[PDB]
Amino acid sequence: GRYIGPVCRLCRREGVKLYLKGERCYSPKCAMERRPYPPGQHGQKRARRPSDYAVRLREKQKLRRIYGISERQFRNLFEEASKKKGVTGSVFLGLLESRLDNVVYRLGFAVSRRQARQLVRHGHITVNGRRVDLPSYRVRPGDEIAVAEKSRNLELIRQNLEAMKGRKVGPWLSLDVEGMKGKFLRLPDREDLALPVNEQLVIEFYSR
Amino acid sequence: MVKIRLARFGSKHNPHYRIVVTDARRKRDGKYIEKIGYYDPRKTTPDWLKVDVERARYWLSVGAQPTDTARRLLRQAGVFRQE
Amino acid sequence: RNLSALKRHRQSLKRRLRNKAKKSAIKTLSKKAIQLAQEGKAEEALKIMRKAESLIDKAAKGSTLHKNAAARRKSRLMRKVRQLLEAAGAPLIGGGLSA
Amino acid sequence: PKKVLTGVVVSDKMQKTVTVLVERQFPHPLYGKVIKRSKKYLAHDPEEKYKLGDVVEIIESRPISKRKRFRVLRLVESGRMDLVEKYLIRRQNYESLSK
RNA sequence: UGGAGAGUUUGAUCCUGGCUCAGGGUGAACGCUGGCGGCGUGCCUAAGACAUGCAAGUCGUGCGGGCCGCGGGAUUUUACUCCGUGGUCAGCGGCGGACGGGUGAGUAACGCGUGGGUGACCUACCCGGAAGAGGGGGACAACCCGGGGAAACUCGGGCUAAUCCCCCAUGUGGACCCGCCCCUUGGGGUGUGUCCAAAGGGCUUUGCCCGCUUCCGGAUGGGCCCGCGUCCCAUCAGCUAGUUGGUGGGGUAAUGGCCCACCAAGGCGACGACGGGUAGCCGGUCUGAGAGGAUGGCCGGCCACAGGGGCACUGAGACACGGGCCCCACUCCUACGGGAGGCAGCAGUUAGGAAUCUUCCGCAAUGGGCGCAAGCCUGACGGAGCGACGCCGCUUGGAGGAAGAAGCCCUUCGGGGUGUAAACUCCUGAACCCGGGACGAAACCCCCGACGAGGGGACUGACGGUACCGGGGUAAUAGCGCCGGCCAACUCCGUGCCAGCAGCCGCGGUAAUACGGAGGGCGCGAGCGUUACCCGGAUUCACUGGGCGUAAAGGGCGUGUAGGCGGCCUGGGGCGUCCCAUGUGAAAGA
Numbered sequence A: 001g002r003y004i005g006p007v008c009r010l011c012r013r014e015g016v017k018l019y020l021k022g023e024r025c026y027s028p029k030c031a032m033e034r035r036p037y038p039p040g041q042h043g044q045k046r047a048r049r050p051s052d053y054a055v056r057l058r059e060k061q062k063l064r065r066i067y068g069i070s071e072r073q074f075r076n077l078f079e080e081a082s083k084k085k086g087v088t089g090s091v092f093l094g095l096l097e098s099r100l101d102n103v104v105y106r107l108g109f110a111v112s113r114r115q116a117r118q119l120v121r122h123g124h125i126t127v128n129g130r131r132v133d134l135p136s137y138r139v140r141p142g143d144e145i146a147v148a149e150k151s152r153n154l155e156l157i158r159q160n161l162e163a164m165k166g167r168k169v170g171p172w173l174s175l176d177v178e179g180m181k182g183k184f185l186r187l188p189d190r191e192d193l194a195l196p197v198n199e200q201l202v203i204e205f206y207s208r
Numbered sequence B: 001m002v003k004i005r006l007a008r009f010g011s012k013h014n015p016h017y018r019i020v021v022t023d024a025r026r027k028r029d030g031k032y033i034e035k036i037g038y039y040d041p042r043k044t045t046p047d048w049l050k051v052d053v054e055r056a057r058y059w060l061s062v063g064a065q066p067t068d069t070a071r072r073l074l075r076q077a078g079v080f081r082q083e
Numbered sequence C: 001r002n003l004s005a006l007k008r009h010r011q012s013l014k015r016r017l018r019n020k021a022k023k024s025a026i027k028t029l030s031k032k033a034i035q036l037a038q039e040g041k042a043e044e045a046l047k048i049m050r051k052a053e054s055l056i057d058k059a060a061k062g063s064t065l066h067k068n069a070a071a072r073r074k075s076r077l078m079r080k081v082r083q084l085l086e087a088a089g090a091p092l093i094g095g096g097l098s099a
Numbered sequence D: 001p002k003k004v005l006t007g008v009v010v011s012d013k014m015q016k017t018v019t020v021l022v023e024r025q026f027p028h029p030l031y032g033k034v035i036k037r038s039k040k041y042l043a044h045d046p047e048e049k050y051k052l053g054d055v056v057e058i059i060e061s062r063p064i065s066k067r068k069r070f071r072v073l074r075l076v077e078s079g080r081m082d083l084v085e086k087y088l089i090r091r092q093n094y095e096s097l098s099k
Numbered sequence E: 001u002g003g004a005g006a007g008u009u010u011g012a013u014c015c016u017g018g019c020u021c022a023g024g025g026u027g028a029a030c031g032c033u034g035g036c037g038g039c040g041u042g043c044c045u046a047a048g049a050c051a052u053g054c055a056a057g058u059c060g061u062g063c064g065g066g067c068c069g070c071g072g073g074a075u076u077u078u079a080c081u082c083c084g085u086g087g088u089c090a091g092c093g094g095c096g097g098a099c100g101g102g103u104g105a106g107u108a109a110c111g112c113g114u115g116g117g118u119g120a121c122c123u124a125c126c127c128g129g130a131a132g133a134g135g136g137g138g139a140c141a142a143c144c145c146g147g148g149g150a151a152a153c154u155c156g157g158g159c160u161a162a163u164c165c166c167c168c169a170u171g172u173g174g175a176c177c178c179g180c181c182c183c184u185u186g187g188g189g190u191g192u193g194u195c196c197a198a199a200g201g202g203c204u205u206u207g208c209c210c211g212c213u214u215c216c217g218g219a220u221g222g223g224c225c226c227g228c229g230u231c232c233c234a235u236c237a238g239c240u241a242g243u244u245g246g247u248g249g250g251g252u253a254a255u256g257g258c259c260c261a262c263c264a265a266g267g268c269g270a271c272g273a274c275g276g277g278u279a280g281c282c283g284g285u286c287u288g289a290g291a292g293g294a295u296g297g298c299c300g301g302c303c304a305c306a307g308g309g310g311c312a313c314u315g316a317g318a319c320a321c322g323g324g325c326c327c328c329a330c331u332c333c334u335a336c337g338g339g340a341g342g343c344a345g346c347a348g349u350u351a352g353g354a355a356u357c358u359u360c361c362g363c364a365a366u367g368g369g370c371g372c373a374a375g376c377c378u379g380a381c382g383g384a385g386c387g388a389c390g391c392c393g394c395u396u397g398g399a400g401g402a403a404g405a406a407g408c409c410c411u412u413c414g415g416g417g418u419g420u421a422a423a424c425u426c427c428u429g430a431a432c433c434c435g436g437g438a439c440g441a442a443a444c445c446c447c448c449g450a451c452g453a454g455g456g457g458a459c460u461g462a463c464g465g466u467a468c469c470g471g472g473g474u475a476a477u478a479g480c481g482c483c484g485g486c487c488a489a490c491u492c493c494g495u496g497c498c499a500g501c502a503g504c505c506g507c508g509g510u511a512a513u514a515c516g517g518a519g520g521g522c523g524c525g526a527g528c529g530u531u532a533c534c535c536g537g538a539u540u541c542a543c544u545g546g547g548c549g550u551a552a553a554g555g556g557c558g559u560g561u562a563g564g565c566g567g568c569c570u571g572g573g574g575c576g577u578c579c580c581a582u583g584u585g586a587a588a589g590a
């Protein structure tokens, strides 16, 4: 099951701060502030002109590591998008973005995808009333991703729903803050996300 | 003797039958002469039962005994109901 | 190690017996008819052939010879008898043939 | 429909029967070229009426023999000893093809 | 909506050319590792051998008995006997045992695939229609009495019923000879002549039901014929006496040298006959940009086989896996004369093998067989069990947390790394405990109605006390491969052409990013590696898509056989070729 181990640690290695640790990876350190380089004995050593493979690799790692999903699962999603009608890279970002464990986090019910996953497994989240505990669930457009009435009380739901009192929400989403529930309006366009990752190198990574 | 009767499709703990005509001597999930409906015993769909009834009447007309449960379902969509 | 529908073997033997029997008599009769006809014979030739006829049909009733296996034998026999008959003289006792 | 083939008579050296060579041409399954291919059929001739060099139609039939399954339907044209000759050399060619 | 290339011949270059890798795939096996569940799938080898249990029956509404019971009767004497009823056993008679299940040995062939023929044919049960069922006679088991055998069993004698068997009649009709008419292979029709039917049972008993006989039809299933397609070797080139055709017979449901007598001298072959090797074929599966290559496990269709080889009987169907006969091999019983037997059904045992499961629950569901029904049978099937064998889902925590603990690795001795990683603070609560708890199942059947239509009613869950719901509630598993280039990831020790690595180029001879250990890093993650096999890259058999002066490759030269190819103009035909309709192209798969 999914990654598990040192993390704002590729808030290093991939070269760019990935948002993985949530509230800290925001505040003098996704260690990227304190150490903007690769991990281990050789981290700050003279860089090496890397291969058009090494390049393509890294990029797909990056994207995959953001959303926390595995290579097995990732690779399939992609496969599915090539056979699908339309420009392929976007579509994939689309499907990637339509995963419950991430919509929940996009609505700020949790501060981390890692944390937002645990809310889905552990019950605390619903899809149009009915309770849903698969982080991989494909939210389609028109769905309502609510908090569990029985879970509203929890210190963590409250503290987090609270910091969203002011905050803005994605163009393809909405958010009734005091009813502790939101809405997947449509699937986002490449333009709508500002992801630190050139998608066409991913396509190209899987063409050999 | 030729039969109207139920062939098991679907999967495990997911029965789904196809109401088929066939020669009686063929295995159950083997080659049928004609599909004429389907049936979901768990009614997990609003449309869990359906029957081309002009065709049912056809075969009945050329002699085809239905299983007993083939005929129950045939009735529900009034294959035998007159006037 | 004892399957009581070996009853089917008992029966078969009986029908074999019954069957063999009717057959044997259709031959020894048909043979006898064509013979008398290769000799120019009114009554005696057809009389037999017409006994032979019956016997065939009779055997067709059951599982013996059923069908048109029947017919075949009637055709072959009552062709032959007639042929041989004009291959000499006499045509008489009307018996079996549409003269 | 009972297949009708047309070819040439290349043998009447058999009683009530003729060997009828039938050609056929087509695209080659992989290599494009139109190739020819040919076949003798033994066709039934009850009135030994056709003979050497007749071009004849040929029809699917109820089996007459082991390997007669066609009947001579009609004459198309007489003569054609060229085609017959053409055949006959190809046959006599095989003589100095041995060891 | 589709196509990537790299390493390696030289001191260097270009080219040719082979090898090798990166990707997908599998009924896999093997190493280390291993938490949960769902859906799949699991003897590829010896078509070797098999212990034990189950896998095909059912019908008393076809018939007569035996054996163990109960009840009532004839007599007022208990012997003898008539009737009724319950067990239970087989027998006779019917239907089923030709389906369902297994397996791929054989088979290069009308076996399969595809499209057609059948004027050359058959089809039990089912449906529609027409017309019938009036008399008589017989036997063989059961049962009883003998005799032979050790056993399997067997031979004789006597009695008997029926939906068992025969005779005679009635002939809606149908069969055959002959003739005539239509049609055109043996299809319809028709006239004399001959020939051929039947069975009874149950009652809610004169009016129904389950059946019976003859005929024409329908439906479904199948037989035989034909065109085209169907691997390798020409270091297999000539093959053939039922052989090719004829006439006439037999045989069959039916064509045909299928078989037989007689006549004739024919048939096949470089367009590959004959011979040898290999193989069940297809829907489809995998791979590929495609063309194509490879493949035919599972599921579905057709074939063949049932220890090896013959044969027939019964029957609508068989030349029959759990029917029969004989020969061969093999195992067992044997009183040595003789018998018995056949898991390529489900389990399971053994043997070969790198490798392939439970002697499980249920007939509750679907399907099948017999029965009027109730029901009985079904290792078909529906489920559970075992394998990470495959695919999918999910857990081993979440948020805080130092200019950063300890330990371990480097160190130009300042420091750098593991590392927010742990510690520890709050949070959630896989597992586990409690409570409740399914759908899958409404029919058949009974009651109203009319045995219809329609209405009503009841019985029935193997999976299972499972899924799912509610309540409580514990921080609670991580491994494997790799870091010389191709290919993503580097440093210290150890070791010295040793020990060892290695897919290919190639690493190791005291400073090794290539060996072995460390730390660290890269990639995947309940997996990760390895070996084998397939397509790929390989335009490296080149149709798409290659070549031959010197790289592999022009025959030593002619002559010419077959074959391939063929100038200008016109015309006919319409085989090639093109277009439109229409049929076929099953379902599953994509």
Ligand SMILES: [Mg+2]
Binding pocket: none
């Ligand atoms: Mg060199």
Ligand SMILES: [Mg+2]
Binding pocket: none
């Ligand atoms: Mg061969």
Ligand SMILES: [Mg+2]
Binding pocket: none
């Ligand atoms: Mg190594």
Ligand SMILES: [Mg+2]
Binding pocket: none
């Ligand atoms: Mg190729």
Ligand SMILES: [Mg+2]
Binding pocket: none
């Ligand atoms: Mg030269």
Ligand SMILES: [Mg+2]
Binding pocket: E560
């Ligand atoms: Mg020349």
